Amino acid sequence: VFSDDAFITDWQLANLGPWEKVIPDSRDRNRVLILSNPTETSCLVSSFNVSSGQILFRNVLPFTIDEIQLDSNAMVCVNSSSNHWQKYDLHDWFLLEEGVDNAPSTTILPQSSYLNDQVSIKNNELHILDEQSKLAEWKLELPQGFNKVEYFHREDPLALVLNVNDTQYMGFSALIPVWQRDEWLTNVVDYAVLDVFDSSLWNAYWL
Amino acid sequence: LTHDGFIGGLDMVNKGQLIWKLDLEIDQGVKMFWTDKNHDELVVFSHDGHYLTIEVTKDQPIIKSRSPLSERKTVDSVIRLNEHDHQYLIKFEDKDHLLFKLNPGKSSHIFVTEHDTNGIYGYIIENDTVKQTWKKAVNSKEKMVAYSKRETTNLNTLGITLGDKSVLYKYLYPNLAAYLIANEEHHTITFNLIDTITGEILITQEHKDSPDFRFPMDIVFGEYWVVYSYFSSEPVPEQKLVVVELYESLTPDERLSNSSDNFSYDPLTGHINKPQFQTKQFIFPEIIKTMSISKTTDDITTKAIVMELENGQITYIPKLLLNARGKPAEEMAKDKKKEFMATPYTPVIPINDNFIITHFRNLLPGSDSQLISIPTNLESTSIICDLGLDVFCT
Amino acid sequence: AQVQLQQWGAGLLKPSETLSLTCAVYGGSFSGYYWSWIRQPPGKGLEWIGEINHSGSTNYNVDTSKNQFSLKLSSDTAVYYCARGLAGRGYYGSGSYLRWGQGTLVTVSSASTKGPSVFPLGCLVKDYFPEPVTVSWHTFPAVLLYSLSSVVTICNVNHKPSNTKVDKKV
Amino acid sequence: DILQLSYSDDAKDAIPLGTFEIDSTSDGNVTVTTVNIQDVEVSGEYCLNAQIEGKLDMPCFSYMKLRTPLKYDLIVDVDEDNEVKQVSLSYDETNDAITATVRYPEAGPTAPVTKLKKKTKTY
Amino acid sequence: ARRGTIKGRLDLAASNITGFVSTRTSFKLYQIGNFSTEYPYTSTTMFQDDEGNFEFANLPLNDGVNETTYYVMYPASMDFNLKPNRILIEFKNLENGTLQLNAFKNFFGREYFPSKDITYPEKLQSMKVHPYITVELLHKAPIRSYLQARN
Amino acid sequence: DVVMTQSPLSLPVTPGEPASISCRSSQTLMNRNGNNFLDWYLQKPGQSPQLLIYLGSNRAPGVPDRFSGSGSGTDFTLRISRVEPEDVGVYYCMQALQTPSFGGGTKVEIRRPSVFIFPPSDETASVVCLLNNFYPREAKVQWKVDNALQSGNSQESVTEQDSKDSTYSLSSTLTLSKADYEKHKVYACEVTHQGLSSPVTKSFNRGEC
Ligand SMILES: *[C@@H]1O[C@H](CO)[C@@H](O)[C@H](O)[C@H]1NC(C)=O
Ligand SMILES: *[C@@H]1O[C@H](CO)[C@@H](O)[C@H](O)[C@H]1NC(C)=O
Ligand SMILES: *[C@@H]1O[C@H](CO)[C@@H](O)[C@H](O)[C@H]1NC(C)=O
Ligand SMILES: *[C@@H]1O[C@H](CO)[C@@H](O)[C@H](O)[C@H]1NC(C)=O
Ligand SMILES: *[C@@H]1O[C@H](CO)[C@@H](O)[C@H](O)[C@H]1NC(C)=O
Ligand SMILES: *[C@@H]1O[C@H](CO)[C@@H](O)[C@H](O)[C@H]1NC(C)=O
């Protein structure tokens, strides 16, 4: 009943909404943590292999985004009304430790600083510059849209992420469009249905 | 329609490839309506007080109109008025109601009824104006919690039968809504089954069973029956489904005041029959966020209550396991009067994983999500869709 | 232009006090952009850089609400815009301001509002204070006390600082 | 505890219609007494008003098509504390007047679960 | 003030399941008995470690003459089926002054404590809690097995 | 501290042709990576600013193909492949190295005449003379009553060219009290203008109103 049409008939989409923070992972270096869709009581925190659309896991945690910070890594979070703090492990979202006595530590998350280091877009076309010997390796056209580079990893499992349009998002590697994502669908309020469909007597006898 | 400003067509087949996507400039979306039954032209409402009219075609759409509303005010919601008369009611925050005569789409009273946590109000439209018809606010300490109306139903059977071809005449009054009140320190989940027109209560049922008021509770209104669910402790700390079933007469064979040849009863006046009820509840393993009802075009199959849980999981359980007038199964044994194959009362409903949809999927539905039942043909099958933060159907 | 900004304020403020205007966001990606204001003095000019980040980045010639995404500033007459700026450099920003705010008009005077008195002829409105009055179903700039007319080519003149909502036929 | 009941035109005034009193005689049983009812010509659609000075004032609690042979059963609704909770009206054929009943919430089942047995310790 | 603290660890060692995700299984705590807080205490935890530790802490408590606080923990897995399926937590004062820990192994849909009138009622089974509360999958059906197969 | 100067303050150009507008700065603009951090903007009247170019020569999203830029160091240039009448309004420079100021003001003036007069209102008094959709850019409005001029107390408002026909427009209002205003019967707005030849006046008695 189910085994025959298990994944064939069931039809799931996962949405994250417009990114707000993205943090690289301590291990499995082609992987990050995706923070998205803030709300006044909670926010969406997830773990994600960068080289696909493959979400590893998701959680709704009851903190405004600003509490969510690295350690002094171990992704420390501290409630501000009370003194309640949760230490969660990045790789597998284990709640390393809890307290109300004191937060262990905090480090406010750093800003991009991607320009002046790795980025130049000069002939309406992007060029990745080495910091020294600015040879303009791995150059790529600007698409019709471009808003931002979300993330870029220079290490051996290279990955680059673009906020090309407001809702379209492109992953790249050594350029080649490697994968494509769309997060316009992150919150729907109201719905409607549209269906599709296909496309005297004597003379009647003969016709 | 997104919570942002975007409309788009998603295919129900082919794993939801995006059929087409249109961008608005409304900056948050509230509601969707087909301007007429033709299912060709939508009207879509802004949070800010604009409205757009959009032409749905096999080609990509076109924004065939944008315009303001009469007053550029922020809108809380919209309630669909008549298809033929092409009216809509808009509730603005600041609690201001506007009658809406949108376009040609190229006594005869109407009643419309809206809810807040402050109360249940009711409203009547006459002469191109809205007037308050009554009010019912809970008191200060109290707070209305959960509400549902009566979804319209195509009619199959006017009465539930018994073994000896005897009939109990399930209660069919169309002008009903049901709702909850939770009051602190009383620890009294009160259930009312109210005539949504008049305001008479007809039923009270409280439960001083140490409710929580912190876990979700929800209410769904069935064909002739109502189910609402809550969490509480005094029986046990466990989720609780409560079913009430509404019958014309609890006597085994009686049609109480329902002769219909030409009587033509009036609800507005209040000479209607009043039901008797029978209620039971059940013990449930997991905390229930939200409930709704499966459908098809014709209300034929068992109405197959669908549940959405805290974890995101979905589960359907049939209507029949939730039988008020069930018996504890010692007194059923060739007790001829009960029903045809009456499944017993059996308060402990264990979870059966075979029922579950989203077998291993996660389906994070977000803080505010809705279950809807989309009818199809092929009446054995029905679509149920979970729209909100994540979209999903089956 | 979908992800766009909205502006709040008050119509009159006296000379020599800080000037309160409050933006509002209805679109995503707050963290990752630099958010600034602009002044446009009438007299063919525009100048401001007060750019900010989700973390404190105050840099004047400025408050933010990460809960509400409604950035805020309290410091003469000008037209005042919210904006959205890229965050290319680390702690500097990268300019490139697009998807602008739709504008507040500020008359920094001690005088008070005066609802626009409206007079048929197309549509005319006599000397009124402050500016502007918005006609709907052509119109030149109002001229100094402000008086404003609209030609027909009926007249829903409407004045938010006065909340004077006057309709008239030509 | 005096209640005054009055229909209103909703534009002219609330024209009085009756007066009732609520006494808690027993430990846990309230009751209503009709101190007086003032019937005048009534015909057509009207909005009702109910007020108990002190505790309760429900200005528009219901709306009915009324007639001068008042033949309604007035359900005032109470709860474990002897305090008025609601006021509403239904139609009963047999009164030829307004008679009022106080109502307690008809407590719900608290339906049963499996129980521990009786000395399944040495048996 | 002295508090309680739940210690526990779901094993995943007798099982060879190690490609699990650890984010789809959630233990939850509720308070029923003798609470003066105008809301019973409640909480929800996730895992701590690969071997599966989970922990609640800062637990409010009653104090004085054998003062009891009834917590209940909900062992569940949305990927497995856990054999206990319900846990009782009993937190009484010793006359010595220490606080005694006792837990019990209930199941879905039975009373926890007897009905105050049965003479010599039956008592629920306790479980050894020196190392920790040790929750387990079902021996016989470790997997949840949502998927019914034809044939 | 960088001061930015736009070379043409006004650039009348016929529709159709390619064109270029220059801009200069005090300091040099050149990033270590090779970015210049200079942006070009457009403002049509009645609208929020609109971004055209984001690095001096590149193009930002949602801009037509016609526009492009060039330059480096201290000097930079906008350049349009084909001029069209829609792109009418003021054009602005901006530098993002430190403290952007929006120094600029290139006022494209692609223009290298309807007369309307409506009667006074019931109430003081205001007659409106509207010179709407005049191309030649040069008109002066004065008022005439019983062969006597009245150029004083003439509050005038000149708006810029249109985006479609590129025609300048202006309005003039002569405000008098009813005691001041009504002593004379017939009034006339008379205009001296460049596109036509002989001065044009539109005069009104009461008539309808
Ligand atoms: C991480 O994601 C990439 C992209 O699909 C995939 O190739 C890789 O196998 C993933 N990692 C593991 C351990 O499977
Ligand atoms: C911190 O805990 C308090 C205690 O209830 C809660 O009200 C508050 O919302 C928490 N902080 C945040 C940011 O939610
Ligand atoms: C951004 O806009 C373009 C132009 O309309 C369109 O292709 C699409 O909506 C987006 N493009 C990409 C590459 O995301
Ligand atoms: C709660 O406290 C009361 C005394 O107030 C006591 O009689 C009772 O046994 C305690 N436990 C429970 C479960 O009620
Ligand atoms: C605990 O129970 C014992 C039972 O004999 C009783 O004597 C003692 O007073 C109680 N007190 C405390 C503090 O636990
Ligand atoms: C002291 O407390 C311990 C547990 O902490 C208990 O085992 C012992 O019996 C107590 N002492 C006496 C004399 O009961």
PDB file of N, CA, C and O in Angstrom, chain A residues 87-127:
ATOM      1  N   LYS A  87      24.229  25.802  24.563  1.00  0.00           N
ATOM      2  CA  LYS A  87      25.414  25.511  23.768  1.00  0.00           C
ATOM      3  C   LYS A  87      25.111  24.288  22.911  1.00  0.00           C
ATOM      4  O   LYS A  87      24.948  23.184  23.455  1.00  0.00           O
ATOM      5  N   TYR A  88      25.039  24.490  21.590  1.00  0.00           N
ATOM      6  CA  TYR A  88      24.689  23.465  20.609  1.00  0.00           C
ATOM      7  C   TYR A  88      25.847  23.120  19.687  1.00  0.00           C
ATOM      8  O   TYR A  88      26.539  24.012  19.186  1.00  0.00           O
ATOM      9  N   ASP A  89      26.051  21.825  19.457  1.00  0.00           N
ATOM     10  CA  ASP A  89      27.168  21.384  18.636  1.00  0.00           C
ATOM     11  C   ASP A  89      26.821  21.597  17.169  1.00  0.00           C
ATOM     12  O   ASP A  89      25.725  21.246  16.724  1.00  0.00           O
ATOM     13  N   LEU A  90      27.763  22.161  16.419  1.00  0.00           N
ATOM     14  CA  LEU A  90      27.479  22.556  15.043  1.00  0.00           C
ATOM     15  C   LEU A  90      27.193  21.364  14.139  1.00  0.00           C
ATOM     16  O   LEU A  90      26.228  21.370  13.368  1.00  0.00           O
ATOM     17  N   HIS A  91      28.037  20.335  14.217  1.00  0.00           N
ATOM     18  CA  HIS A  91      27.959  19.235  13.261  1.00  0.00           C
ATOM     19  C   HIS A  91      26.647  18.458  13.385  1.00  0.00           C
ATOM     20  O   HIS A  91      26.046  18.100  12.365  1.00  0.00           O
ATOM     21  N   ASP A  92      26.166  18.196  14.621  1.00  0.00           N
ATOM     22  CA  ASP A  92      25.010  17.320  14.825  1.00  0.00           C
ATOM     23  C   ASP A  92      23.955  17.912  15.754  1.00  0.00           C
ATOM     24  O   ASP A  92      23.103  17.163  16.239  1.00  0.00           O
ATOM     25  N   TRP A  93      23.954  19.229  15.952  1.00  0.00           N
ATOM     26  CA  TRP A  93      22.960  19.923  16.773  1.00  0.00           C
ATOM     27  C   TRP A  93      22.676  19.218  18.098  1.00  0.00           C
ATOM     28  O   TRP A  93      21.523  18.996  18.475  1.00  0.00           O
ATOM     29  N   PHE A  94      23.739  18.876  18.821  1.00  0.00           N
ATOM     30  CA  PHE A  94      23.582  18.352  20.167  1.00  0.00           C
ATOM     31  C   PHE A  94      23.693  19.521  21.118  1.00  0.00           C
ATOM     32  O   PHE A  94      24.598  20.345  20.988  1.00  0.00           O
ATOM     33  N   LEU A  95      22.838  19.531  22.135  1.00  0.00           N
ATOM     34  CA  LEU A  95      22.804  20.646  23.071  1.00  0.00           C
ATOM     35  C   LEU A  95      23.909  20.389  24.081  1.00  0.00           C
ATOM     36  O   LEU A  95      23.686  19.802  25.144  1.00  0.00           O
ATOM     37  N   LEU A  96      25.137  20.720  23.651  1.00  0.00           N
ATOM     38  CA  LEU A  96      26.358  20.525  24.431  1.00  0.00           C
ATOM     39  C   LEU A  96      26.130  20.818  25.904  1.00  0.00           C
ATOM     40  O   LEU A  96      26.522  20.033  26.773  1.00  0.00           O
ATOM     41  N   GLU A  97      25.501  21.952  26.204  1.00  0.00           N
ATOM     42  CA  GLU A  97      25.297  22.292  27.611  1.00  0.00           C
ATOM     43  C   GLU A  97      24.293  23.426  27.748  1.00  0.00           C
ATOM     44  O   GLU A  97      24.000  24.145  26.796  1.00  0.00           O
ATOM     45  N   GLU A  98      23.717  23.518  28.941  1.00  0.00           N
ATOM     46  CA  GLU A  98      22.731  24.524  29.294  1.00  0.00           C
ATOM     47  C   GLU A  98      23.136  25.213  30.580  1.00  0.00           C
ATOM     48  O   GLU A  98      23.827  24.634  31.423  1.00  0.00           O
ATOM     49  N   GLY A  99      22.707  26.461  30.720  1.00  0.00           N
ATOM     50  CA  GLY A  99      22.828  27.069  32.031  1.00  0.00           C
ATOM     51  C   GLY A  99      21.936  28.276  32.170  1.00  0.00           C
ATOM     52  O   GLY A  99      21.372  28.785  31.199  1.00  0.00           O
ATOM     53  N   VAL A 100      21.821  28.724  33.416  1.00  0.00           N
ATOM     54  CA  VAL A 100      21.185  29.991  33.757  1.00  0.00           C
ATOM     55  C   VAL A 100      22.130  30.827  34.617  1.00  0.00           C
ATOM     56  O   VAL A 100      21.916  32.030  34.795  1.00  0.00           O
ATOM     57  N   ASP A 101      23.196  30.209  35.138  1.00  0.00           N
ATOM     58  CA  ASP A 101      24.141  30.954  35.966  1.00  0.00           C
ATOM     59  C   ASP A 101      24.885  32.001  35.147  1.00  0.00           C
ATOM     60  O   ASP A 101      24.955  33.172  35.537  1.00  0.00           O
ATOM     61  N   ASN A 102      25.456  31.601  34.015  1.00  0.00           N
ATOM     62  CA  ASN A 102      26.213  32.531  33.194  1.00  0.00           C
ATOM     63  C   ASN A 102      26.390  31.938  31.809  1.00  0.00           C
ATOM     64  O   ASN A 102      26.523  30.723  31.654  1.00  0.00           O
ATOM     65  N   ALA A 103      26.413  32.809  30.809  1.00  0.00           N
ATOM     66  CA  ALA A 103      26.794  32.371  29.480  1.00  0.00           C
ATOM     67  C   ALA A 103      28.270  31.976  29.484  1.00  0.00           C
ATOM     68  O   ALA A 103      29.074  32.608  30.176  1.00  0.00           O
ATOM     69  N   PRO A 104      28.665  30.931  28.743  1.00  0.00           N
ATOM     70  CA  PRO A 104      30.103  30.604  28.698  1.00  0.00           C
ATOM     71  C   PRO A 104      30.933  31.710  28.074  1.00  0.00           C
ATOM     72  O   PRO A 104      31.930  32.150  28.660  1.00  0.00           O
ATOM     73  N   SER A 105      30.540  32.172  26.894  1.00  0.00           N
ATOM     74  CA  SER A 105      31.212  33.262  26.200  1.00  0.00           C
ATOM     75  C   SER A 105      30.363  33.602  24.986  1.00  0.00           C
ATOM     76  O   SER A 105      29.370  32.931  24.697  1.00  0.00           O
ATOM     77  N   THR A 106      30.762  34.655  24.281  1.00  0.00           N
ATOM     78  CA  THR A 106      30.106  35.022  23.037  1.00  0.00           C
ATOM     79  C   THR A 106      31.128  35.633  22.096  1.00  0.00           C
ATOM     80  O   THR A 106      32.148  36.174  22.527  1.00  0.00           O
ATOM     81  N   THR A 107      30.842  35.530  20.800  1.00  0.00           N
ATOM     82  CA  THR A 107      31.555  36.283  19.773  1.00  0.00           C
ATOM     83  C   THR A 107      30.539  36.668  18.710  1.00  0.00           C
ATOM     84  O   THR A 107      30.029  35.797  18.000  1.00  0.00           O
ATOM     85  N   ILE A 108      30.258  37.968  18.595  1.00  0.00           N
ATOM     86  CA  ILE A 108      29.330  38.430  17.574  1.00  0.00           C
ATOM     87  C   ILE A 108      29.884  38.070  16.205  1.00  0.00           C
ATOM     88  O   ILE A 108      31.091  38.166  15.951  1.00  0.00           O
ATOM     89  N   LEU A 109      29.001  37.626  15.326  1.00  0.00           N
ATOM     90  CA  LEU A 109      29.447  36.973  14.110  1.00  0.00           C
ATOM     91  C   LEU A 109      30.043  37.998  13.145  1.00  0.00           C
ATOM     92  O   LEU A 109      29.508  39.103  13.007  1.00  0.00           O
ATOM     93  N   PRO A 110      31.139  37.672  12.464  1.00  0.00           N
ATOM     94  CA  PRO A 110      31.836  38.684  11.670  1.00  0.00           C
ATOM     95  C   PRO A 110      31.119  38.979  10.363  1.00  0.00           C
ATOM     96  O   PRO A 110      30.376  38.156   9.823  1.00  0.00           O
ATOM     97  N   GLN A 111      31.364  40.183   9.856  1.00  0.00           N
ATOM     98  CA  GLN A 111      30.788  40.600   8.591  1.00  0.00           C
ATOM     99  C   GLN A 111      31.604  40.022   7.435  1.00  0.00           C
ATOM    100  O   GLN A 111      32.706  39.497   7.619  1.00  0.00           O
ATOM    101  N   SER A 112      31.034  40.111   6.230  1.00  0.00           N
ATOM    102  CA  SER A 112      31.566  39.387   5.077  1.00  0.00           C
ATOM    103  C   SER A 112      32.995  39.805   4.749  1.00  0.00           C
ATOM    104  O   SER A 112      33.920  38.985   4.783  1.00  0.00           O
ATOM    105  N   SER A 113      33.194  41.081   4.423  1.00  0.00           N
ATOM    106  CA  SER A 113      34.493  41.578   3.969  1.00  0.00           C
ATOM    107  C   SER A 113      34.960  40.849   2.714  1.00  0.00           C
ATOM    108  O   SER A 113      36.162  40.677   2.494  1.00  0.00           O
ATOM    109  N   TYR A 114      34.017  40.417   1.880  1.00  0.00           N
ATOM    110  CA  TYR A 114      34.383  39.650   0.697  1.00  0.00           C
ATOM    111  C   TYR A 114      35.071  40.528  -0.339  1.00  0.00           C
ATOM    112  O   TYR A 114      35.990  40.075  -1.033  1.00  0.00           O
ATOM    113  N   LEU A 115      34.654  41.784  -0.454  1.00  0.00           N
ATOM    114  CA  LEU A 115      35.352  42.697  -1.340  1.00  0.00           C
ATOM    115  C   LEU A 115      36.714  43.046  -0.766  1.00  0.00           C
ATOM    116  O   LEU A 115      36.946  42.972   0.442  1.00  0.00           O
ATOM    117  N   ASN A 116      37.623  43.412  -1.667  1.00  0.00           N
ATOM    118  CA  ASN A 116      39.029  43.708  -1.421  1.00  0.00           C
ATOM    119  C   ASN A 116      39.857  42.454  -1.165  1.00  0.00           C
ATOM    120  O   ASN A 116      41.084  42.564  -1.048  1.00  0.00           O
ATOM    121  N   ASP A 117      39.242  41.269  -1.092  1.00  0.00           N
ATOM    122  CA  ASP A 117      39.944  40.014  -0.857  1.00  0.00           C
ATOM    123  C   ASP A 117      39.827  39.032  -2.009  1.00  0.00           C
ATOM    124  O   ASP A 117      40.848  38.532  -2.498  1.00  0.00           O
ATOM    125  N   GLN A 118      38.604  38.747  -2.463  1.00  0.00           N
ATOM    126  CA  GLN A 118      38.339  37.659  -3.392  1.00  0.00           C
ATOM    127  C   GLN A 118      37.446  38.058  -4.553  1.00  0.00           C
ATOM    128  O   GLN A 118      37.115  37.196  -5.374  1.00  0.00           O
ATOM    129  N   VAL A 119      37.063  39.327  -4.662  1.00  0.00           N
ATOM    130  CA  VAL A 119      35.918  39.731  -5.465  1.00  0.00           C
ATOM    131  C   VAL A 119      36.295  40.923  -6.326  1.00  0.00           C
ATOM    132  O   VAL A 119      36.901  41.884  -5.839  1.00  0.00           O
ATOM    133  N   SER A 120      35.936  40.853  -7.605  1.00  0.00           N
ATOM    134  CA  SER A 120      36.002  42.001  -8.499  1.00  0.00           C
ATOM    135  C   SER A 120      35.065  41.720  -9.660  1.00  0.00           C
ATOM    136  O   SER A 120      35.105  40.627 -10.232  1.00  0.00           O
ATOM    137  N   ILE A 121      34.231  42.698 -10.005  1.00  0.00           N
ATOM    138  CA  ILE A 121      33.237  42.549 -11.063  1.00  0.00           C
ATOM    139  C   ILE A 121      33.374  43.792 -11.927  1.00  0.00           C
ATOM    140  O   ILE A 121      32.709  44.796 -11.665  1.00  0.00           O
ATOM    141  N   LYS A 122      34.128  43.698 -13.021  1.00  0.00           N
ATOM    142  CA  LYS A 122      34.625  44.891 -13.700  1.00  0.00           C
ATOM    143  C   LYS A 122      34.022  45.110 -15.079  1.00  0.00           C
ATOM    144  O   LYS A 122      33.516  46.200 -15.355  1.00  0.00           O
ATOM    145  N   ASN A 123      34.091  44.123 -15.967  1.00  0.00           N
ATOM    146  CA  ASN A 123      33.422  44.222 -17.267  1.00  0.00           C
ATOM    147  C   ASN A 123      32.021  43.624 -17.221  1.00  0.00           C
ATOM    148  O   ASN A 123      31.657  42.793 -18.051  1.00  0.00           O
ATOM    149  N   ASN A 124      31.209  44.082 -16.264  1.00  0.00           N
ATOM    150  CA  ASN A 124      29.882  43.513 -16.008  1.00  0.00           C
ATOM    151  C   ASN A 124      29.982  41.994 -15.858  1.00  0.00           C
ATOM    152  O   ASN A 124      29.119  41.232 -16.299  1.00  0.00           O
ATOM    153  N   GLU A 125      31.067  41.555 -15.227  1.00  0.00           N
ATOM    154  CA  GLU A 125      31.475  40.160 -15.205  1.00  0.00           C
ATOM    155  C   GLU A 125      32.394  39.972 -14.018  1.00  0.00           C
ATOM    156  O   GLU A 125      33.293  40.784 -13.797  1.00  0.00           O
ATOM    157  N   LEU A 126      32.198  38.882 -13.294  1.00  0.00           N
ATOM    158  CA  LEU A 126      32.915  38.683 -12.052  1.00  0.00           C
ATOM    159  C   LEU A 126      34.239  37.993 -12.315  1.00  0.00           C
ATOM    160  O   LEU A 126      34.374  37.183 -13.234  1.00  0.00           O
ATOM    161  N   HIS A 127      35.226  38.363 -11.506  1.00  0.00           N
ATOM    162  CA  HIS A 127      36.537  37.740 -11.505  1.00  0.00           C
ATOM    163  C   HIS A 127      36.939  37.501 -10.063  1.00  0.00           C
ATOM    164  O   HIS A 127      36.894  38.425  -9.245  1.00  0.00           O
TER     165      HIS A 127
END
